[PDB]
Amino acid sequence: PFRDIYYRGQTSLHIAIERRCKHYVELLVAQGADVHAQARGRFFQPKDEGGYFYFGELPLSLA
Amino acid sequence: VFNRPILFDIVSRGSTADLDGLLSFLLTHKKRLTDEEFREPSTGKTCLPKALLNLSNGRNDTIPVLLDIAERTGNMREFINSPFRDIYYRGQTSLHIAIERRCKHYVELLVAQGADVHAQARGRFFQPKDEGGYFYFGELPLSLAACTNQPHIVNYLTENPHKKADMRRQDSRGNTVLHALVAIADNTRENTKFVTKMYDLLLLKCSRLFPDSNLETVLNNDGLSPLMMAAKTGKIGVFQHIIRREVTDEDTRHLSRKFKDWAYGPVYSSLYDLSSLDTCGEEVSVLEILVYNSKIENRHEMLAVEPINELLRDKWRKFGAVSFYINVVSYLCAMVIFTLTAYYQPLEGTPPYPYRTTVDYLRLAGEVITLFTGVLFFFTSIKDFQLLYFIYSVLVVVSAALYLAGIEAYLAVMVFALVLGWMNALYFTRGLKLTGTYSIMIQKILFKDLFRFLLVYLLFMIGYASALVTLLNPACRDSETFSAFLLDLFKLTIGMGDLEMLSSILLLVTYIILTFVLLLNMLIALMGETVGQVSKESKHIWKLQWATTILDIERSFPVFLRKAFRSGEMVTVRRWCFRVDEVNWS
Incomplete structure (x- = not known):
C-alpha cells in the first residue's frame, strides 16, 4: 500500500501484470496476492483529472 | 616529353611501355616531376590529377606505379599534394579527387604513401551554391568523403595506419564534418536519410575517440553549432533527427537528446534535452534563430518538432498568457x-x-x-x-x-x-x-x-x-x-x-x-x-505570430528573474531537460 499522492495504493501485482509477463503474475497470485486492489492514485486517474493513465483501478481491469 | 600534352594523353590512356620509357628519359634529364613542364601555365595540373579524372571503371591500378617515379625524381613531398592555382579551383588535391571518384583502393594507396589529409581546398568552385560556387563539403578530405555518401572511406581515413585526419579539425569556414554534412543536407528523403545515418556514425566515432568533448560542442567561425546551423538554413531533414537523437552504447549516453525516464505501459514520458534551445539570454538558441529569422524556408514545420512546439505552449500557459x-x-x-x-x-x-x-x-x-x-x-x-x-x-x-x-x-x-x-x-x-x-x-x-x-x-x-x-x-x-x-x-x-x-x-x-x-x-x-x-492562413501563420509574441514577451522582462522551463537531474542523465507525455498503443 504505497503512500505517495503521486502513487496511492499501487500494488506489486499491478506492476507485475503491467510489465507484460504472466509467469510472475502466476507466482504472486498463487502465493496469495490480493487481486482486489483499489489503486486510487492520482497518477492512475483519467488524463483530464491530473493523472496519466486510468485503467479501472483493479488488477483484472489493469490486465 | 617534348610537349606536355602527349604526356598527358599517355597517362590518360594508361600505356606503360612508352610510359616507363618516359620515366627513363625523365631520369636522364634530371628534371623534377613537379617542374613547370608537367604543370599547366594556368591551372598547374600535375600528372596525378589528369590520371585520376580519367578513371576508367577503377582501372587506374597502374598509375600508382607512375607515382613510384616520384622518389626516383627526388621530389616526393610536394609531388603528392597538388596546390592548384585556378580561381575556379584553388587548393584542390589529388586525394580529394581520388576520394570523390568513389573508390577506396587509390585513397588507401595515396594516404599510405603520405598524402596530406589536412588539405584546405579553398576554391571558388568549392564554396556554397549561394556564393558563386557549385559544391561545398567542408574543404577537407575527410569532410569530402563524408558529404559525398562514402561511409567506408570516412571509416578508413579515420582508422588508417598512417596520419588519420582528426574529425575535430576545422576548415577555414570553421565548419568541420558535422557542419559540412548539414550544409549539403537537403530536405528530401534520400539526402536526409543518408546524411542523418552518416551523421550519427560520425558523432559516435568522434565520441569514442574523444569522450572528453563531443563534436557537437565545437562551433564554427560563425559560432552557430551544428544544430543551430541546421536550424538557421532550413535543414529540417537533419534538424528533426538532431532533436530526437538517442543512442544505445553506454559510453555514448551523454550524446543523446531524448531520454526516456519512466513509462507506465501505454504512456511514455519522453524527456527531451533542450540544453541548447533556451540559453536564458546567455547565448544564441535554436528558438531565437528559428523564430526571429525569415530566411528559413520551412518555419511552420520546423516549429512543429515536438520539444519546440510543446515548449512554446508551456511558456505560453505558464507565463505567456498573463504577461500578454x-x-x-x-x-x-x-x-x-x-x-x-x-x-x-x-x-x-x-x-x-x-x-x-x-x-x-x-x-x-x-x-x-x-x-x-x-x-x-x-x-x-x-x-x-x-x-x-x-x-x-x-x-x-x-x-x-x-x-x-x-x-x-x-x-x-x-x-x-x-x-x-x-x-x-x-x-x-x-x-x-x-x-x-x-x-x-x-x-x-x-x-x-x-x-x-x-x-x-x-x-x-x-x-x-x-x-x-x-x-x-x-x-x-x-x-x-x-x-x-x-x-x-x-x-x-x-x-x-x-x-x-x-x-x-x-x-x-x-x-x-x-x-x-x-x-x-x-x-x-x-x-x-x-x-x-x-x-x-493554412492554420499556421497565426502560430508563427503567437510564437513571436511569446518570445518577445520572454525577452522583454529580464531573465535573471527565475522564469525558466523545466529542470532535471545532476549528472549522467546537469542537463536542463524538459518533459513531454505521449500515449501510444503499439
Whole structure:
C-alpha cells in the first residue's frame, strides 16, 4: 500500500501484470496476492483529472 | 616529353611501355616531376590529377606505379599534394579527387604513401551554391568523403595506419564534418536519410575517440553549432533527427537528446534535452534563430518538432498568457487615458499650466501617464514593427516638448501620436481573441490598391481635363484653371454619380466607364488573391505570430528573474531537460 499522492495504493501485482509477463503474475497470485486492489492514485486517474493513465483501478481491469 | 600534352594523353590512356620509357628519359634529364613542364601555365595540373579524372571503371591500378617515379625524381613531398592555382579551383588535391571518384583502393594507396589529409581546398568552385560556387563539403578530405555518401572511406581515413585526419579539425569556414554534412543536407528523403545515418556514425566515432568533448560542442567561425546551423538554413531533414537523437552504447549516453525516464505501459514520458534551445539570454538558441529569422524556408514545420512546439505552449500557459494580457490591457487603458486627455484637452488653447481644478488634476494625471508611457516606449525602442512604435514614441516626446513650451496650434503632433498609437493597437491585438487575419490583410492589399487607384484615377482625370478645358476657355468652374474641381467631379462620379458637366464629349463617358470597371474588377481580383493566399492562413501563420509574441514577451522582462522551463537531474542523465507525455498503443 504505497503512500505517495503521486502513487496511492499501487500494488506489486499491478506492476507485475503491467510489465507484460504472466509467469510472475502466476507466482504472486498463487502465493496469495490480493487481486482486489483499489489503486486510487492520482497518477492512475483519467488524463483530464491530473493523472496519466486510468485503467479501472483493479488488477483484472489493469490486465 | 617534348610537349606536355602527349604526356598527358599517355597517362590518360594508361600505356606503360612508352610510359616507363618516359620515366627513363625523365631520369636522364634530371628534371623534377613537379617542374613547370608537367604543370599547366594556368591551372598547374600535375600528372596525378589528369590520371585520376580519367578513371576508367577503377582501372587506374597502374598509375600508382607512375607515382613510384616520384622518389626516383627526388621530389616526393610536394609531388603528392597538388596546390592548384585556378580561381575556379584553388587548393584542390589529388586525394580529394581520388576520394570523390568513389573508390577506396587509390585513397588507401595515396594516404599510405603520405598524402596530406589536412588539405584546405579553398576554391571558388568549392564554396556554397549561394556564393558563386557549385559544391561545398567542408574543404577537407575527410569532410569530402563524408558529404559525398562514402561511409567506408570516412571509416578508413579515420582508422588508417598512417596520419588519420582528426574529425575535430576545422576548415577555414570553421565548419568541420558535422557542419559540412548539414550544409549539403537537403530536405528530401534520400539526402536526409543518408546524411542523418552518416551523421550519427560520425558523432559516435568522434565520441569514442574523444569522450572528453563531443563534436557537437565545437562551433564554427560563425559560432552557430551544428544544430543551430541546421536550424538557421532550413535543414529540417537533419534538424528533426538532431532533436530526437538517442543512442544505445553506454559510453555514448551523454550524446543523446531524448531520454526516456519512466513509462507506465501505454504512456511514455519522453524527456527531451533542450540544453541548447533556451540559453536564458546567455547565448544564441535554436528558438531565437528559428523564430526571429525569415530566411528559413520551412518555419511552420520546423516549429512543429515536438520539444519546440510543446515548449512554446508551456511558456505560453505558464507565463505567456498573463504577461500578454497585462501588456495589452495596460496599453489599451493608457491609450484610452491619452484619448480622453485629448478629448478633455484644455479648452481655449494656451495651456501653459491650466490645472487649478479637481478634474484638471485628473487630466494632468492622465497627461503624466501618457508622457510616462511614451518615454518608457522610447526607452524600450532604443534598447530594442519597431518602426511604428518608435514613430509613436518620438511623436509623444515632441508633443510633450511643445506642450511644455506653452505654445498653441501644435496639438496636431499629439493627435498624430494618438492615431499612430491606435494603429499600433491592432498590431498588439493581433494576439488577442485568436485574431491576426487583420495584420495579414493590412500587408496584402494596402500597397496594390493605392498604387493602381492613384495611377489610373489621376490619369484618366488629366485626360478628361484636357478635353474639358478644350471645350471651355462655367459648369465645372467659374474661372481660372484648377484640376481640383475635376478631381471633385471624378469623386462624385465614382462614389456619388449624378455627375454634371458643361457638356449636355463621349470619350468622357468612356473614361468614366473604364475607371469604374477597372476599380470594381480590381477589388474582385484583390478578394480572389487574398482568399487564395490566406487559405485560412493554412492554420499556421497565426502560430508563427503567437510564437513571436511569446518570445518577445520572454525577452522583454529580464531573465535573471527565475522564469525558466523545466529542470532535471545532476549528472549522467546537469542537463536542463524538459518533459513531454505521449500515449501510444503499439
